[PDB]
Design a protein around this ligand. Structure first.
Ligand code: HEC
Length: 71
């Protein structure tokens, strides 16, 4: 995946360039809060205001897993 590139044009759109939370809660430390399995699910199936399947395909995987490393 280019996980970061995706995030840098998908998640940051609400989570902020910095992932520190802007229009949405900070996922900077999502990988610590929740496992790739959970984060991936959230990306795929959104959550509250977050529309599910913002990323799809290996995109979402790479993002989630890259985030699993980002703590
Ligand atoms: C704005 C339309 C969003 C985009 C684009 C992405 N996310 Fe998001 N996310 C958003 C909100 C409003 C919320 C909270 C939803 C609620 O009201 O309950 C979230 C939540 C997450 C979470 C879980 C955090 C938590 O609720 O405890 C994760 C792990 C997450 N989001 C990841 C994520 C990624 C990686 C995205 C890019 C593919 C992404 N989000 C986009 C709003 C928005």
């Amino acid at each position: 995946v280019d996980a970061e590139a995706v995030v840098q044009q998908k998640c940051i759109s609400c989570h902020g360039g910095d992932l520190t939370g802007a229009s949405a809660p900070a996922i900077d430390k999502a990988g610590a809060n929740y496992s790739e399995e959970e984060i991936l699910d959230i990306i795929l199936n959104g959550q509250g205001g977050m529309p599910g399947g913002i990323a799809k395909g290996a995109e979402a995987e790479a993002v989630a897993a890259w985030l699993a490393e980002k703590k």
